[PDB]
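Long-time lurker, first post. I've been practising inverse folding by hand and with some scripts of my own, and I keep getting stuck on stretches where the structure tokens seem ambiguous. Below is the full token string for one chain I'm working on. Before anyone asks, I'm not after the true native sequence, just a reasonable design that respects the backbone. If someone could post their per-position residues I'd love to compare against what I wrote down in my notebook.
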């Protein structure tokens, strides 16, 4: 089947909304996290952290805050993998 949830109620700040709006309308991970394509693991994580807290399901009860948080992960986690310049293992 398919999962579905109703979020009739929506209470949050501009910052949050703006986040979920950008993520859902992001063309890449850099845009989501809000960093440059030439940043380091420390950077990507920094942006992912600050954001995560904002999109966190414990801070943002928004109906989209959930989806947003999910995107971030796929973004950061992915980017990081690329961050690696040389193949450590193999």
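-- Answer (accepted) --
I ran through it position by position. Result:
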């Amino acid at each position: 089947g398919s999962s579905g949830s109703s979020g009739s109620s929506a209470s949050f700040t501009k910052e949050q909304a703006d986040a979920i709006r950008r993520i859902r309308n992001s063309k890449d991970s850099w845009d989501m996290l809000g960093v440059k394509p030439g940043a380091s693991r420390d950077e990507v994580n920094k942006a992912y952290r600050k954001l995560a807290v904002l999109l966190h399901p414990d801070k943002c009860v928004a109906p989209g805050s959930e989806d947003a948080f999910k995107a971030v992960v796929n973004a950061r986690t992915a980017l990081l993998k690329n961050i690696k310049s040389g193949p450590s293992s193999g």
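A couple of notes from the structure itself: The chain has one domain: 1-90. The CA atoms of residues 55 and 70 lie 9 Å apart. Happy to go over any region you disagree with.
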